Ligand binder design. Structure first.
Ligand SMILES: NCCc1c[nH]c2ccccc12
Length: 144
């Protein structure tokens, strides 16, 4: 199951707001809670109960932007998400990470993984100027 599959599956109050979502803008409520769980699982960033996986993010974050703060932000955000209910957990992880100083680099790792899993860029693809354009054109095909 891919991010595209999760998007295909959006109910219709959320799908008119696709581009907001795909800009990493925060949207609340339990429809969003279950989209973001779907996508975080599709990208292999959270466990089944929806808890952030430290080890899926630590190395990828640090390769792009080497920074001690990724450890700190990961521990904080996992700590938060564990304390909310499972319906809400992956979304809370996602929201926390985006708000932290790791947000910048998280969006890059997230973009890269999305397009790697979509077969659109090679598995060793780095966050290059070319890649930024590939992402923009990919979004444009989606009306974003
Ligand atoms: N290329 C980023 C697309 C994106 C950002 N946040 C999302 C949340 C749900 C699904 C896609 C996204």
């Amino acid at each position: 199951e891919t991010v595209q599959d999760c998007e295909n599956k959006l109910p219709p109050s959320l799908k008119s707001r696709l581009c907001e979502i795909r800009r990493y803008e925060i949207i609340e409520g339990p429809e969003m809670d279950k989209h973001i769980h779907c996508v975080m699982r599709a990208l292999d960033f959270v466990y089944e109960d929806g808890r952030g996986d430290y080890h899926k993010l630590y190395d990828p974050l640090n390769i792009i932007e080497l920074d001690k703060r990724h450890d700190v932000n990961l521990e904080k955000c996992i700590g938060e998400c564990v304390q909310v209910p499972t319906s809400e957990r992956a979304h809370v992880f996602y929201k926390c990470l985006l708000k932290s100083t790791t947000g910048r680099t998280f969006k890059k790792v997230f973009d890269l993984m999305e397009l790697k899993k979509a077969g659109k860029v090679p598995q060793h693809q780095r966050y290059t100027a070319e890649f930024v354009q590939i992402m923009k054109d990919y979004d444009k095909a989606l009306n974003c």
